Design a binder for this molecule. Structure first.
Ligand SMILES: O=C(CNc1ccccc1)N[C@@H](C(=O)NO)c1ccc(-c2cc(F)c(F)c(F)c2)cc1
Ligand SMILES: [Mg+2]
Ligand SMILES: [Mg+2]
Ligand SMILES: [Mg+2]
Ligand SMILES: [Mg+2]
Ligand SMILES: [Mg+2]
Ligand SMILES: [Zn+2]
Length: 889
């Protein structure tokens, strides 16, 4: 079990200058011939030449056209090809090889594989070595000349990186295409695609050089009608990079390709971006609303990599957050600008503070630049991506837009065409910082701790107001809990975007202000503050921290109603809910523990309920924001605040709070559900795939949230509304009708109706599976067995498996059944999946990430299943390493 250490980075003793590939796809095998034009680097010390090569069948290998002989001159152990140094030339030489691989049976979806009838590659991070021999690491930059051949009837469309420079016929019904890609690239950005693909295309003219760029979007023929939105999103992405960052695409063509079988969302292979079909394809008749934001963000994300990852690439994999954190940040800026809805930023914060905060307080906790790894497939985490994105966003908060753009351009201009490290980016930001502060003594050395220190900081506040002096003080403290990565945690550079709200009229009392907290504690004083303010803290969620605002619920209500910042309003609401949840949770827990025959629960604050009503009834307030305020915080957010969390007690706590609020507001909810119908379900543009209205989609979100609240409440005759909702043309609506009908005897009638609506579109059927999996059904285990027998079967498609099982694992009452039967079920699925796709097997482990935060009985139950999976003799490297880390072995 080889551990790679960040501090051990050393350049290779070799250079690979040119790659010339011939990939010949046949019925039962694929033959890969490769010539590498190589050289000896200045770091060489006479070592053996060792290539990565995993699962390759060697036909021959040669150096300078002399066939090498196994045993005497090289050894191969299915992982490394070692050429003994006595046979390695001392000057420029050619290494060639012919190997056989088998994409048809490559169900792990790394390297070269078959997805339905498409041959497709996935090489990030270390998958190129499953295609041919290489020094498979991103600092080995080379030129590529790639020829693909295949049966012409089965595979008429051939694609790789670069320019297609030849197309030719081959005897026996075959054909070939040659692709030359002269710019240097790392091998993880290599890609090849072969299939019977159909496309949409357009021409984009760049903003400054006025270059014509051909844009192509590809899918299997059945789904070509679902490509239109992706093409629009690509045009939008190109314009945003031009408009915000001044960056234009440099190549003549950009291809996007959807495949059905994909481990993640999409991949930024140079000029040949490859997508999970669920993140590229949509139509209004066959997709839920969520698909439209997903395609926009994933198309944008892969496009933004062309600069932040492709043109400026990574020195080594420890720098992953340099391209992923920065590209997620660029993707989020883009998405916020395109949607023009406050819920876009709120949705990102919601994900961070539930999923990523849980990870950062789990045994898996790591900084955004870890110190070591064993599995590279396990290295791709919400910490590296989403905390990384918040760390890259804090630079923008600190610098402001003008100086951020200046620093970002310094980064691009200095590193374009080269590998880079996190320090290179911090250095570029620091030059901007010196400019903004007007002294070359300023530095961002402390900022680097955001890359090395794991765990979530806690920031807490105390206040003081002197009415006679008109002087206001904010006392701030920061603290990070020690963990396995640092025994002593250092103070970070924390930017705190702040406003001060006048509680009498709701107005801003100071200009835009970002406090720079760089010590364990500091006191920030404001003069000429005419009345005691309510502070608006961490506007926009300006640092990835636990905020302890120390405000009363009365103060939080005033911010919720009258503050200018969407996040602080949403967070104030969140904090009111959390105070209520923790109180009622403890009251329910004590009654359970003490076996009480009677007890009292503290009711929900009536003025809070009044404020929710006030906002809901405001016709000028945002429908998406409204949907957030009527929803309790996510379970995975709540769990960060409770030790030994009893999931039944939490389910009872949530049920009480929702019933308390609904008992007061259900008539408001119903009136709104009806009044929103006309605008929410407007069909004017239903047959225009280019017309996407994020505000309208947010009104549907609000309607479907309200319908869920009313159905759980058994609001009088709400089943009539449910049935009518099932007839809506919009899948978001008619799939909602299935889930909310769970509380009625019509559930299985709607189950069958929506199945019939879904079964003939692959992606819609997966959305149907998720809806079933998520259904609040007491017979959910029996239902899951029915899905297994009738729909899922032995599919190896990750989208199918994830759709059936992951939503169910969020069922607080049923997945965490005290028998442990839910833990048993998902562990059986993980073990079964691990036989053919270890990466996806580790994704299915997600519900176990909180195991040591549950009550002691459920801890034991989860740990038992995890130890059972660890005892499987055939466990993958991925799954073993993951579960060993997660269980603190
Ligand atoms: O789709 C997404 C969504 N985010 C996300 C996914 C997973 C974890 C954390 C964040 N993220 C992609 C990206 O960043 N695209 O730009 C991405 C992610 C992973 C690999 C990859 C694939 C493999 F098959 C591997 F074996 C491997 F090691 C890595 C490729 C692309
Ligand atoms: Mg093999
Ligand atoms: Mg323009
Ligand atoms: Mg995203
Ligand atoms: Mg299928
Ligand atoms: Mg540990
Ligand atoms: Zn990415």
């Amino acid at each position: 079990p080889k551990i790679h250490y960040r501090k051990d980075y050393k350049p290779s003793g070799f250079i690979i200058n040119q790659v010339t590939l011939n990939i010949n796809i046949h019925d039962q095998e694929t033959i890969v011939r490769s010539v590498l034009d190589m050289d000896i680097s200045k770091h060489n010390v006479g070592e053996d030449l060792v290539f990565d090569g995993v699962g390759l069948k060697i036909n021959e290998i040669s150096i300078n056209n002399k066939k090498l002989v196994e045993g005497e001159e090289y050894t191969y152990d299915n992982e490394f090809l070692t050429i003994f140094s006595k046979f390695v030339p001392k000057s420029k030489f050619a290494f060639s090889s012919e190997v056989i691989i088998h994409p048809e049976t490559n169900y792990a979806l790394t390297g070269l594989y078959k997805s339905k009838n498409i041959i497709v590659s996935q090489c990030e991070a270390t998958g190129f070595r499953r295609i041919t021999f290489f020094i498979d690491r991103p600092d080995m930059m080379a030129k590529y000349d790639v020829t693909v051949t295949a049966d012409k009837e089965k595979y008429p469309v051939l694609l790789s990186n670069g320019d297609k420079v030849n197309e030719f016929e081959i005897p026996g019904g075959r054909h070939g295409a040659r692709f030359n890609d002269p710019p240097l690239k790392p091998c993880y950005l290599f890609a090849v695609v072969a299939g019977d693909l159909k496309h949409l295309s357009a021409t984009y003219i760049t903003k400054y050089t006025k270059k014509k760029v051909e844009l192509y979007v590809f899918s299997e023929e059945k789904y070509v009608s679902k490509l239109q939105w992706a093409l629009e999103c690509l045009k939008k992405s190109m314009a945003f990079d031009e408009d915000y960052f001044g960056l234009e695409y440099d190549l003549s063509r950009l291809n996007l390709v959807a495949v059905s079988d994909f481990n993640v969302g999409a991949m930024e292979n140079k000029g040949l971006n490859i997508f999970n079909a669920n993140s590229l394809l949509a139509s209004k008749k066959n997709s839920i609303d969520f698909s439209y934001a997903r395609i926009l963000t994933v198309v944008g994300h892969e496009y933004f990599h062309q600069y932040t990852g492709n043109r400026v690439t990574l020195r080594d994999w420890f720098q992953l957050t340099l391209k992923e954190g920065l590209t997620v940040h660029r993707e989020n800026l883009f998405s916020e600008e395109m949607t023009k809805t406050v819920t876009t930023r709120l949705s990102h914060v919601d994900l961070l503070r539930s999923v990523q905060f849980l990870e950062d307080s789990s045994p898996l906790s790591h900084p955004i630049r870890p110190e070591s790894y064993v599995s590279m497939e396990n290295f791709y985490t919400t910490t590296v991506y989403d905390k990384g994105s918040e760390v890259m966003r804090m630079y923008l908060t600190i610098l402001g837009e003008e100086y951020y753009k200046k620093g970002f351009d310094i980064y691009i201009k200095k590193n374009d065409g080269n590998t880079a490290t996190c320090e290179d980016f911090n250095y570029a930001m620091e030059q901007a910082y010196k400019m903004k502060k007007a002294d070359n003594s300023a530095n961002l050395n402390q900022y680097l701790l955001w890359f090395s220190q794991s765990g979530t900081p806690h920031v807490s506040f105390k206040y003081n107001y002197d009415a006679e002096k008109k002087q206001y003080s904010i006392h701030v403290n920061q603290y990070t809990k020690p963990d396995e990565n640092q025994k002593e945690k250092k103070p970070l550079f924390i930017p705190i975007s702040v406003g001060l709200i006048n509680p009498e009229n709701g107005k801003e009392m100071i200009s835009q202000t970002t406090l720079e907290l760089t010590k364990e504690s500091d006191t920030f004083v404001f003069n000429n503050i005419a009345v005691k303010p309510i502070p608006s803290l961490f506007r926009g969620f300006s640092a990835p921290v636990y905020i302890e605002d120390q405000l009363t619920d009365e103060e939080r209500i005033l911010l919720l109603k009258y503050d200018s910042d969407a996040f602080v309003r949403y967070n104030s609401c969140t904090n009111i809910y959390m105070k209520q949840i923790l109180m009622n949770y403890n009251e329910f827990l004590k009654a359970k523990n003490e076996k009480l025959e009677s007890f009292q629960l503290t009711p929900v604050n009536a003025q809070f309920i009044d404020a929710i009503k006030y906002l809901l009834e405001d016709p000028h307030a945002d429908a998406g924001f409204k949907s957030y305020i009527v929803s309790l915080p996510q379970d995975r957010y709540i769990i960060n605040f409770v030790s030994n969390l009893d999931t039944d007690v939490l389910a009872d706590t949530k049920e009480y709070i929702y019933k308390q609020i609904g008992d007061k507001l259900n008539d408001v909810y119903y009136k709104m559900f009806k009044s929103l119908e006309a605008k929410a379900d407007d069909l004017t543009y239903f047959n225009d795939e280019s017309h996407v209205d994020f505000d309208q989609m947010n009104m549907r979100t609000l309607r479907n949230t309200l319908l869920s609240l009313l159905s759980k409440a058994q609001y009088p005759n709400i089943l009539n509304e449910i049935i009518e909702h099932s007839k809506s043309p919009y899948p978001s609506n008619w799939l909602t009708s299935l889930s909310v009908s769970a509380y009625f005897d019509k559930y299985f009638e709607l189950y069958d109706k929506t199945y019939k609506l879904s079964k003939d579109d692959e992606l819609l059927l997966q959305e149907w599976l998720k809806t079933v999996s998520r259904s609040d059904r007491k017979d959910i285990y029996e239902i899951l067995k029915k899905l297994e027998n009738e729909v899922l079967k032995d599919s190896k498609n990750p989208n199918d498996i994830r759709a059936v099982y992951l939503p169910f694992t969020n069922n607080l009452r049923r997945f965490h059944d005290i028998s442990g039967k839910g833990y048993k079920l998902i562990a059986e699925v993980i073990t079964k999946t691990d036989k053919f796709n270890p990466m996806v097997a580790t994704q299915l482990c997600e519900p176990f990430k909180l195991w040591n935060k549950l009550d002691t009985k459920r801890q034991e139950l989860m740990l038992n299943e995890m130890n059972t999976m660890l005892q499987e003799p055939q466990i993958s490297n991925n799954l073993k390493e993951y579960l060993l880390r997660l269980t603190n072995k």
